[PDB]
Amino acid sequence: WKPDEQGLQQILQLLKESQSPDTTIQRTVQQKLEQLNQYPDFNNYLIFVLTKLKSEDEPTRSLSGLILKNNVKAHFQNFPNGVTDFIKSECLNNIGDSSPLIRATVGILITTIASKGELQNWPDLLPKLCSLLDSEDYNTCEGAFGALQKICEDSAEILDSDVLDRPLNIMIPKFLQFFKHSSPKIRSHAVACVNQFIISRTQALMLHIDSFIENLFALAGDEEPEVRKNVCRALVMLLEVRMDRLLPHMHNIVEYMLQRTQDQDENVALEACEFWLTLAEQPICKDVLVRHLPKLIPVLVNGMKYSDIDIILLKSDWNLRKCSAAALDVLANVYRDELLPHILPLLKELLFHHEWVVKESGILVLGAIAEGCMQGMIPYLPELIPHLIQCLSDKKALVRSITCWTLSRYAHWVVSQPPDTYLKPLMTELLKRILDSNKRVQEAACSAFATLEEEACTELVPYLAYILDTLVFAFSKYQHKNLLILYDAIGTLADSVGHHLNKPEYIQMLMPPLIQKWNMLKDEDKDLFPLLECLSSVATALQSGFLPYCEPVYQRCVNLVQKTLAQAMLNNAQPDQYEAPDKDFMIVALDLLSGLAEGLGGNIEQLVARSNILTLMYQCMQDKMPEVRQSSFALLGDLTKACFQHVKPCIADFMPILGTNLNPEFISVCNNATWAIGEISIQMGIEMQPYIPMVLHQLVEIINRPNTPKTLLENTAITIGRLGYVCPQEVAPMLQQFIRPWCTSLRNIRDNEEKDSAFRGICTMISVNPSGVIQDFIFFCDAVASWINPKDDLRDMFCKILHGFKNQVGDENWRRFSDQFPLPLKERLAAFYGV
Numbered sequence: 001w002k003p004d005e006q007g008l009q010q011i012l013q014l015l016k017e018s019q020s021p022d023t024t025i026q027r028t029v030q031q032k033l034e035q036l037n038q039y040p041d042f043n044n045y046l047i048f049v050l051t052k053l054k055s056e057d058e059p060t061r062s063l064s065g066l067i068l069k070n071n072v073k074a075h076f077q078n079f080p081n082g083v084t085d086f087i088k089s090e091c092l093n094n095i096g097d098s099s100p101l102i103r104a105t106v107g108i109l110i111t112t113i114a115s116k117g118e119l120q121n122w123p124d125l126l127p128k129l130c131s132l133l134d135s136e137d138y139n140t141c142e143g144a145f146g147a148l149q150k151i152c153e154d155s156a157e158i159l160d161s162d163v164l165d166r167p168l169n170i171m172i173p174k175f176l177q178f179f180k181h182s183s184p185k186i187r188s189h190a191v192a193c194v195n196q197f198i199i200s201r202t203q204a205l206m207l208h209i210d211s212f213i214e215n216l217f218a219l220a221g222d223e224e225p226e227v228r229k230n231v232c233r234a235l236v237m238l239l240e241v242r243m244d245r246l247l248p249h250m251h252n253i254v255e256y257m258l259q260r261t262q263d264q265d266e267n268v269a270l271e272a273c274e275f276w277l278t279l280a281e282q283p284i285c286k287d288v289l290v291r292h293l294p295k296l297i298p299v300l301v302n303g304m305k306y307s308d309i310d311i312i313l314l315k316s317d318w319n320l321r322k323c324s325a326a327a328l329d330v331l332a333n334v335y336r337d338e339l340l341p342h343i344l345p346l347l348k349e350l351l352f353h354h355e356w357v358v359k360e361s362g363i364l365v366l367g368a369i370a371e372g373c374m375q376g377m378i379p380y381l382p383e384l385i386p387h388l389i390q391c392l393s394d395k396k397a398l399v400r401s402i403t404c405w406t407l408s409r410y411a412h413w414v415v416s417q418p419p420d421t422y423l424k425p426l427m428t429e430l431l432k433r434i435l436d437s438n439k440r441v442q443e444a445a446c447s448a449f450a451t452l453e454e455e456a457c458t459e460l461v462p463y464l465a466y467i468l469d470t471l472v473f474a475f476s477k478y479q480h481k482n483l484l485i486l487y488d489a490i491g492t493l494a495d496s497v498g499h500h501l502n503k504p505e506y507i508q509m510l511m512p513p514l515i516q517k518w519n520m521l522k523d524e525d526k527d528l529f530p531l532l533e534c535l536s537s538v539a540t541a542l543q544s545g546f547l548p549y550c551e552p553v554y555q556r557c558v559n560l561v562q563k564t565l566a567q568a569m570l571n572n573a574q575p576d577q578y579e580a581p582d583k584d585f586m587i588v589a590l591d592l593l594s595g596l597a598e599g600l601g602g603n604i605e606q607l608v609a610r611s612n613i614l615t616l617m618y619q620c621m622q623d624k625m626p627e628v629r630q631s632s633f634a635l636l637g638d639l640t641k642a643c644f645q646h647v648k649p650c651i652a653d654f655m656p657i658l659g660t661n662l663n664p665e666f667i668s669v670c671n672n673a674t675w676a677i678g679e680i681s682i683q684m685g686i687e688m689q690p691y692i693p694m695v696l697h698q699l700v701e702i703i704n705r706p707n708t709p710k711t712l713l714e715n716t717a718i719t720i721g722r723l724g725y726v727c728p729q730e731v732a733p734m735l736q737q738f739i740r741p742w743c744t745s746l747r748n749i750r751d752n753e754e755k756d757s758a759f760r761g762i763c764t765m766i767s768v769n770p771s772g773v774i775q776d777f778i779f780f781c782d783a784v785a786s787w788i789n790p791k792d793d794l795r796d797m798f799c800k801i802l803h804g805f806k807n808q809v810g811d812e813n814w815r816r817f818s819d820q821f822p823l824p825l826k827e828r829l830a831a832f833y834g835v
Helices: 005-016 026-034 041-050 058-072 081-092 100-116 125-133 139-154 168-176 184-195 209-219 225-241 243-260 266-279 293-304 320-342 344-349 358-368 381-391 399-408 419-432 439-456 464-477 480-501 504-519 528-541 543-571 584-599 601-609 613-621 626-660 667-688 692-704 710-726 728-746 753-766 777-784 793-809 823-832
Strands: none
Touching (some): 005 026, 041 081, 058 100, 081 100, 100 139, 125 139, 125 168, 184 209, 184 225, 209 225, 225 243, 293 358, 320 344, 480 528, 543 601, 543 613, 584 626, 626 667, 626 692, 667 692, 692 728, 710 753, 753 793, 777 793, 777 823
């Protein structure tokens, strides 16, 4: 290229027309450039003005390159080699321009050509840059390094790989050799680079581990906080990978770490903070920390205190405070209530202080030790709770956030003391603090309310009338983001009040807004889920009062499924054309689809019959994906008990699917399948007969194997009791082998519909093969002495079994059993049943 008048001037005036404080002048240089940015003579003219042309002033020459780097980010593929060739040159030839802004832009280009234009493509890049660290001109080195320092952060995983020659072999020890440099900026860079690789456990570095720490810790000091920053940062990561190095000098490190944790440079303490956080990560020595634990805590607590500069952002990402609080939590868990001694005195001083700031911090601490110091905290609570509830009214905005969130952290104690005494007033304000005109306070409040509900499980039934009226109105006032939380707040509600929610007026205020949000949501919406998720709970607790809304909702649910399988099938056919579906869409549709099939019960026969469900049901159960199979064995069982009338013909199609899916390694997936077989079991009656053989033996094995998640064991014992009821002659021959685990797992369940459906079996079985229980009768009795209310005949069924056996052994030989009894069991037995 070179000169050419017309172009250069046109360029210059474009760049001059740039800095105009005009708005309509701006829309000109946009298109009037986007047009030149398709005309390849362009970019070269940029680097020229940037580099060669020293006549024009400097901020121009900066915008020169800026645009260039802007094109390199966008249109680089185009850039003919002959441009790129030259671009590369002028930047290395001007790596250390003695005019800051230029030096920085020029490096920026390098940074950018390296990252966007591969690195297998700029072979000279590093080799040059290195040789430039070894330059005399200071500026032509600060530049040479600054680049490398970015290249490492950028192409970390590439530098440490087979692409050039693993230059990491030569750069690392070179970087180390540069710790002993004078001017701090260069040392700070020196370590900065090294750091990229400490996590990455690079062999090019480990080879000098000894020498590294040596140069690192021996260095520690270095007045300039830029260096201290990265040392601190090194040690943090170094603590993770090469723990087996720091121990020797551990005690000096930790004492040092407090000074740097209080380094007046916020940005240094910022990092030093994450030290203890990462220390506490490996619980490889709880003892070491105690030494100076009374010293750290107070410091750490002051970190919470809102920086005077944050009252501007909120009145972000990760600040000292956000780190400090996060670190305190973890310390509470390792140390338990033993942490409290150093904390209580300090707390006292905050919590009340004149400051709509320092008080707030005290509150934040209260929430940070909530769970790890949970027990030692119980005593005081009757003091703070009171005030804390008052605190939800504190005039300053941000206080009303933590005041709230800290309370959520204690719900378990609130829901352990008399309903009216603590819950009542809390949920009053907590609820009013939802309607607050401060988004941050709003969201905090609902999340607080959500937690509160998972703990109530029954206490809200009184206050539902008020709860809803505000929550349903909460939509009239909640932007998209705080709307997500409501779905859960609703979800938890119906999920925590049970059926009680069914009321023609309660429904009145709740359904319209939901259906509103429903229709504004297309069938592709990825935030559709949330709506369905709680709708599952809602349709569940709302029982038959949900009928007004299902004929669409149901059909809407099947249609997701329908559409999803088609997507997958076509993908499992033309991956090169149609991409994979998002199965997480079925999962939901399926969950809601048994959500109705639960509380909507027998009525479903309508929608089930005139629906393709029971083939989409078949396809989903074969799915290579588990979460799917889980919630379609679920739907199966639900439907099975809701309307087996329609389900029957597909049994010999389904049974094998379940029988295969009794693979215990899939936790929940099989837990459902097991339960499912139980529901079919009953609904089939004797006709279950042909199926028992395969499933049965597995069920035994499952229930007989130890370490089999408690929930599954129950879901298995019941199913075995189900089969033994419906087909006694076939299962009773096995009694001897599975009585023990059955009893013990089923000894601890609520005497619900299922427990009965199980014990009826175990008896019908006992009455076929009595010899089954002779050695483990003491097991069996411990199972009976769990029944509070046995359904008339069932109570007489047990008493008949007990009395029956006491006769073959007789009186003198009954003591050989009875005396062995634990005190409760003997007392409930010789009481509620027979002698």
